[PDB]
Structure 1
Amino acid sequence: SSMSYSWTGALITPCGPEEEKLPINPLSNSLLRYHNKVYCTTSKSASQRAKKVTFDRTQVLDAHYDSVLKDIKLAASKVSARLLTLQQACQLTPPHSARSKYGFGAKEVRSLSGRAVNHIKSVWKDLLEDPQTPIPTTIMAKNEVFCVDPAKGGKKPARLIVYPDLGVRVCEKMALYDITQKLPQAVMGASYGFQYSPAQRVEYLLKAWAEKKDPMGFSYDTRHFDSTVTERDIRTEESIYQACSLPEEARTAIHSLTERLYVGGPMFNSKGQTCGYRRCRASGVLTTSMGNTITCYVKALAACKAAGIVAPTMLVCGDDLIVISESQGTEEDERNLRAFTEAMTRYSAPPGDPPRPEYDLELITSCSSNVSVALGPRGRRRYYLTRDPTTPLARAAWETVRHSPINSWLGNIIQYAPTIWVRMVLMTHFFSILMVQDTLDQNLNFEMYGSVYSVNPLDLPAIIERLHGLDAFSMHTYSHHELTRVASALRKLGAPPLRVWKSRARAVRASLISRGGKAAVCGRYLFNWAVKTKLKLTPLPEARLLDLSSWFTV
């Protein structure tokens, strides 16, 4: 039926500058050596990304989907949501969020400057009163940093980002913000993924695998998900929102937003030229993650009914998906996943990689992360969440005039603290730099789902214990997979081997303990793995005092 995009063929122009790599990346050139392999996407590769995401889509709904949708709209019916006040909505604007054509910006919006408050009042009135005219959107390349893959044809092209004006975005929060904070949890329950700390996520997969008598899991990511959301998906989700107990002013605005923005609108490049028209999900609206994750839930859950996936347990993070279910022999299980894929493709959510039933939890990957196991001193199996370190390393090497990679180092040390690569590579380089910089106690930002939290480098031991527990400073024997992947990435990036890092880590332990105080606790804990004779670490009193709830939620 419907064509995802159409293109006037104007360029997808960049937004401001696109910083270049420098001839010395002086923070990360003691980390890895092949700074050529570390590249950043760019509006140049936008034309190529355009060509891969455009295609006529044909959706084929059936009674499994119809059944599922109703059980979800009934789950949504249990919801009460409230409008956000124009001012609440305003103060949710991120401090550096892209400014408005009408000369004002995140600065003024969060300050409740009267100029903006007015123009946003006039936006929201026109939202309620006119429920048809399209809302112009801006399309721009997305810039993000990757390592090259010569197997994947070199350098990825830049993901497309489409978003409305800054005044608009605040009204989406007035109409919809409250729903984003409740509906995914009300519809899916524990199937909802973005509520779990890494350890909590691991506990869930473990709980699920254990309660099958013969489990079988697989993962599913949809190829170019933002472009396979059809106009009927986006309206079907508006009727999921409308299932909720809402005030009448909200429903009007919601409906107007769906008709005028969400189901599609003309896209403008940064120079203003009409760039094309969009008939799919704009990645950039408030509902981008709620909408993906819920649309994904039904499609995948209906396709589950359609394949005869037995006793399925689901974990949905955006378009990524894990399904630990009941096995029907290796022979039938294979057959079902084809039915799954076919069903999904019939729903306009075709995969990039054909799913495959797996029977070993380490071999199942989704959300770029997998589970894994290590022994401790106790000879006892401890499970953790790890991932391919090739990209986190690459982003640890992004140094330009304008961006310093250290926040990224924090982010990883926090998120994948138990990993052999964080413990032995990142943590080593982190403190090694901070101490020489003599900024070991200057605060750092840790970013996650758009929230930023203030984090001080010397608190890392108690933070990591509240999130991962003391077992994180005692991982004895890593899996043969992890050992191979970590080795493999260090080679691929010209970083020194893990043997080397053990020598350098010994040193950082010395200076850290020799600074005493908090620095010394970082030594004895974060680098206990490094020493011939391990100190018996005990709980930290600070750990019990920490509130890390909203970190890994939404």
Structure 2
Amino acid sequence: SMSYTWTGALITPCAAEESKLPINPLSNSLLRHHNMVYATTSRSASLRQKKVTFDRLQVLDDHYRDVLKEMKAKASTVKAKLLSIEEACKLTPPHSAKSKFGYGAKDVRNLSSRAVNHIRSVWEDLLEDTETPIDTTIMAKSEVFCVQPEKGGRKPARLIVFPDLGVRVCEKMALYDVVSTLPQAVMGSSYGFQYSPKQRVEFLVNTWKSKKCPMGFSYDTRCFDSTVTESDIRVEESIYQCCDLAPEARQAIRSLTERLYIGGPLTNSKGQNCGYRRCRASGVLTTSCGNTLTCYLKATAACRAAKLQDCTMLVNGDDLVVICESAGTQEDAAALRAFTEAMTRYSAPPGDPPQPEYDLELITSCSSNVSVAHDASGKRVYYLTRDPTTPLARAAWETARHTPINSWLGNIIMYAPTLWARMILMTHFFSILLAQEQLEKALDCQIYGACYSIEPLDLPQIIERLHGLSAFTLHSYSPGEINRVASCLRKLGVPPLRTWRHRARSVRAKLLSQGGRAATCGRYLFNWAVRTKLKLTPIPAASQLDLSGWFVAGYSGGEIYHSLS
């Protein structure tokens, strides 16, 4: 069964695609090697198509089936509520794709008579048609990367697939509660999305220390979505069906599974037939939960085949980390081969093969690795961090162009404690914000496929809740970490880490100068940039935050918008 089949209709853009970074002043202040920062366009989509299109063989064994039965037994404890139309409408992001039926996302959120009526009619249809494949749009995704180690050697665009806005509101009705609460229920400590960065590094470390003589490894899969088989999607459904569901909810899931999730026609932006899909659609609500479930099922089966001892997993969609138990160096390298050849039977061959690590800090996952620093107390605090090449690169983009999602905002949130988000991302953007009278404005950002609307003035307490107060006091960062950031600041052409210190003093003074919530940003965020430190006490607004539904579930192209209605 082919992941995709094509007709020859192109993957068309719906608008004008920008490919290169503008030489903006605000841009160049951050990053001067602007010819290194590109964005993806539909021009590279056929390259991608060649990567994602293959025939997939799949052979399930007793291990797989044991594990599946164990997951279903736990999913049987779940009682999932059916959402009301209004409820699912509220969950729709305001700048989500308009419906081909002359109503939009802002219409849905407003309960526009028209939108609501043909959401209803779509729901009705899901109950009375169990067979007809639902149409989908296929699109080249525009993302900014920095170029790489070879020649100018760029990633092709990712392909997104999504049904109509109406179906997407329906998916939410039938399945939001299921995909929000079943992953934790089935996978427990291993479901990665339940974790704020603090909690995530805490789990990783505690898992590590709990071991004998720990061995760990990431496992990258080649184009995961393309490997998800029709079987995979049906089995996924068999798990959902173990929930207590409402009768309509149950037929809705059964219909969506047959009509949408397992495959269907792909249409371009010109309304032409592009071809057929028989694997995971990136942009349906089940994509994150289903990927996580499927990954954790396959991984856990492959462990037992590989005979790895006392494994623990952290699964985030298709990103898999495994901390387990060394049996000797050559033995370990041999079981890691087995895990792979077993994953390959399950139709999940590896990107570049898994490599046993023996330092926790060496293992990468979710584009991330644990690192160590010290708080003001000299006490060693663990934190999570990554190569800043991509974040800074996109930071360079959102500076020079208006973008719907400001990744930097999310990046300062998730990577509050990191050297590079503190010295560059915080400094850069706050000097901009201050020089533009735009601190009180709220900007949209994503955390785990979920959109929030946040005012940057509330960044210190959001950072304290998630990361701790030490994330304003960290120093003595590790050598290699420091050496990676600096090495990256060269590549991108970013002023080095001593440059950013002065700029910070300047804005920090400009921030204190304003009192109110502004000043507490300057005092807390940029306290690193002085030696006569102010001293830092718990912020009153910290505990009074509603950070519910923040680190509960992942919604990768699930179209979720948790912020205020």
TM-score range for the pair, normalised by the shorter chain length: over 0.9
Percent of matched pairs sharing the same residue: 74
Quote the Cα distance in structure 1 between the aligned partners of 2:281 and 2:404.
29
Q: Residue type of the partner of 1:159?
A: R
| Alignment match, 2:475 | 476
Q: Deviations over 1:469-505 (max 9, x none)?
A: 1111211211122111101111011111112112222
Which residue number in structure 2 is paired with residue 384 of structure 1? 383
SS of 1:66 mapped into structure 2? helix
Query: CA separation in 2, counterparts of 1:98 and 1:347?
Result: 34
Provide Cα deviations, 1:374-394, integer angstroms capped at 9, x if missing partner: 123322211101111000001
Structure 2 counterpart of 1:268: 267
- 1:508 — aligned with what? 507
Give SS of 1:266's match. strand
Deviation per CA, 1:357-384, whole angstroms, max 9, x where unpaired?
1111110110001110012332221110
**How far is the alpha carbon of 1:261 from its aligned partner?**
1.3
Structure-1 residue corresponding to 2:27: 28
> Are 1:296 and 2:295 an aligned pair?
yes
Question: Is 2:487 the partner of 1:488?
Answer: yes
Supply the distance in 1 between the matched residues of 2:122 and 2:157 (Cα, whole angstroms).
Answer: 31
Deviates more, 1:364-373 or 1:254-263: 254-263
Question: 1:551 matched to which residue of 2?
Answer: 550
Shift of 1:327: 1.3
Question: What amino acid is the match of 1:71?
Answer: E
* Amino acid corresponding to residue 206 of structure 2 in structure 1: K
For residues 491 and 544 of structure 1, what CA distance do their matches in structure 2 show? Answer: 40
The correspondence of residues 35-74 of structure 1 with structure 2, limited to 5 A, is: 35-74=34-73
TM-score, length-scaled by structure 2: 0.94
- Write the distance in 2 (CA, Å) between the matches of 1:516 and 1:80: 49
SS of residue paired to 1:17:
coil
For 2:516 and 2:350, locate their aligned partners in 1 and report how far apart those are by CA, in whole Å: 52
Aligned pair in 2 of structure 1 residues 61, 461: CA closer, same or farther (>3 Å)?
same
**What is the CA–CA distance in structure 2 between the aligned matches of 1:274 and 1:248, rounded to whole Å?**
34
Residue identity opposite 1:530 in structure 2: A
Separation of aligned partners in 2, 1:485 and 1:477 = 15
The reply on whether 1:227 has 2:205 as its aligned counterpart is: no
| Secondary structure of 1:182 counterpart | helix
- 1:112-151 mapped onto 2 (5 Å cutoff): 112-151=111-150
| Aligned positions of 1:319-334 closer than 5 A | 319-334=318-333
| Residue of structure 2 in register with 1:211 after alignment | 210
**Compared with structure 1, are the counterparts of its residues 387 and 23 closer, same or farther at alpha carbon in structure 2 (3 Å cutoff)?**
closer
2: distance between equivalents of 1:406 and 1:65?
39
How far apart are residue 45 of structure 1 and its match? 0.4
Structure 1 contact 33–495 (Cα < 8 Å) conserved: yes
* Aligned residue identity for 1:66: R
* AA of the residue aligned to 1:308: K
3-state SS of paired residue (1:194) = helix
Alpha-carbon deviations, 1:215-248, whole Å to 9, x = none?
A: 1111112110010001111111111111111222
Mapped contact 1:19–1:401 kept (Cα < 8 A)? no
| TM-fit CA distance, 1:28 | 2.2
Q: Is the 8 A contact 2:373 2:474 kept in 1?
A: yes
Structure 1 439/256 Cα, relative in aligned 2: closer, same or farther at 3 Å? closer
Give the 3-state SS of the residue equivalent to 2:294 in structure 1: helix
Q: Work out whether residues 21 and 400 of structure 1, in 8 Å CA contact, stay in contact via their aligned partners in 2.
A: no
Cα deviation, 1:327-377, whole Å, max 9, x if unaligned, reads 111221111110011110110011102111111111011000111001233
CA 43–507 in structure 1, closer or farther in 2 if over 3 Å, else same? same
- Cα distance between partner residues in 2 of 1:547 and 1:123: 33
Kindly indicate whether the alpha-carbon contact (under 8 Å) linking 1:25 and 1:399 is maintained by their aligned counterparts in 2.
no
My pick for the range that moved more, 397-406 or 382-391, is: 397-406
1:263 partner letter = I
Cα separation, partners in 2 of 1:229 and 1:404, compared to 1, 3 Å: closer
Which residue of structure 2 lines up, in the alignment, with residue 522 of structure 1?
521
1:25 deviates by: 2.0
Contact 1:263 1:281 in 2 (8 A): yes
Structure 1 pair 455/124, CA: closer, same or farther in 2 (3 Å)? closer
- Give the Å deviation of 1:404: 4.6
Unmatched segments (≥5 aa) in structure 1: none
Residue 452 (str. 1) matches residue 486 (str. 2): no
Q: Secondary structure at 1:437's aligned position in 2?
A: coil
Aligned residues: 553
- TM-score normalized by structure 1? 0.96
- 1:22 is displaced (CA, Å) by 6.3
Q: Deviations over 1:83-111 (max 9, x none)?
A: 22233233322212211222112122222
Which residue of structure 1 aligns with residue 184 of structure 2? 185
**In the aligned structure 2, how far is the partner of 1:400 from the partner of 1:22?**
10
Deviations 1:26-79 (A, max 9, x none): 322211101111111111100110011101100011000010000011111111
Code of the aligned partner of 2:254: H
The residue type paired with residue 92 of structure 2 is T
Measure how far apart 1:269 and its partner are: 0.8
Kept in 1, the 8 Å contact 2:93–2:451? The answer is: no
- Give the Cα separation in 2 of the matches to 1:13 and 1:544: 48
> What is the CA RMSD across the aligned residues, in angstroms?
1.9
Moved more, 132-141 or 112-121: 112-121
Aligned partner letter, 1:362: E
